[PDB]
Amino acid sequence: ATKAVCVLKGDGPVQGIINFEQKESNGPVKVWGSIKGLTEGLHGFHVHEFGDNTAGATSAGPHFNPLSRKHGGPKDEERHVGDLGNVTADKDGVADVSIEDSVISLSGDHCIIGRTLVVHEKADDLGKGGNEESTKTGNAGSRLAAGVIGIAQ
Amino acid sequence: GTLATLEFAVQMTAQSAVDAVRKSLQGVAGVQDVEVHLEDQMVLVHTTLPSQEVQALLEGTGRQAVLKGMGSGQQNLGAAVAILGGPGTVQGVVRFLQLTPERCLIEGTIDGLEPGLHGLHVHQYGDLTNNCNSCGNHFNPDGASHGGPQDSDRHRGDLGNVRADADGRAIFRMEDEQLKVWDVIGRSLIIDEGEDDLGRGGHPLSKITGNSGERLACGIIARSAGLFQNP
Ligand SMILES: [Zn+2]
Ligand SMILES: [Zn+2]
């Protein structure tokens, strides 16, 4: 698929819509959109291995990771494929997301379609946290909102 | 139907918990094998029942039970789930399991429906920005005319009808030989307001949508774990 979209929802006030576009085969993926109702600051932003959300993050699996790496930031070479770092919310709680990424794709073995996108509570420490949980989830805390990434027209 | 292996994660510390769990499943209609693992906190269940029912049977005996995996014995060809929902009272969970390269088990439980036949369809896009209205038309890669599950000339997304009982619950389990799990990952599953006439209504929308009225609920067909893939 050439485009994709995700509608992030949660229990709290956090909600958002995220678009994906990939015009080149295995090319960069434009990730743009907006999330509102966040606290001001950096919020972890990750793609999970599965899109099953029948039991929350349990059924969602760990961070999408077909190359069995440890957690890093988007610009790190040692990263999970689903590691898209932090989005930044403004004083009004609005994070305007604008990202380019070539490790994720909308086709092939890094295809993120069918998988859960999550916006997290705290800042993702980008694998540099000095303890085991930093190499797994990046210590971003609990799930504020999520949705399945689907195919768009 | 075909046998399906369900991998449940069930909490059970004592040996008395293992005995309660095994008793609730063993000797029940449509449950071949049970295979409890105390060390791994796991219960494999070979069955022809819906997963929603086998989950209720486990949960009915005290301890909680989450479904973590789905296959058909020993290579996982593809598993998926669609959580139905939106603005109305309709909500449910439908699971897809690719049994063989040419056969797919679709199985689910849906509540909040008016008693009677409701059409069920895989639509082409998984775009929920305008809820079900943004999901596009019935998934039709072959450029076919609309039909029912029995018609070989049908849209690949055509799953016919689903009967809601007097309590508004609609349980079903079916195998489809044209729909493939990884052909529909990221697309949407939609349940409709009324009956799918299966192309046979003589109405302008009969050969397009089956004239089943408004879309009530819909979800994106998401990737889920096969057996032992999510620990
Ligand atoms: Zn990660
Ligand atoms: Zn159709």
Author numbering:
A (entry chain A): 1 to 153
B (entry chain B): 9 to 82, 84 to 240
What is written in the article reporting this PDB entry?
Superoxide dismutase-1 (SOD1) is one of the most abundant human proteins and is an important part of our antioxidant, redox signalling and respiratory control mechanisms. SOD1 folding, zinc and copper acquisition, and disulphide bond formation can be catalysed by the copper chaperone for SOD1 (CCS), which forms a transient heterodimeric complex with SOD1 to facilitate its maturation. Here, we discover the mechanisms that govern SOD1 maturation and stabilisation through interaction with the chaperone protein hCCS. Combinations of mutants yielded crystallographic structures of full-length hCCS in two different conformers complexed with hSOD1; an hCCS domain II truncation complexed with hSOD1; an hCCS domain II homodimer structure at higher resolution than previously available (1.55 Å); and the hSOD1 disulphide knock-out mutant used to promote complexation.
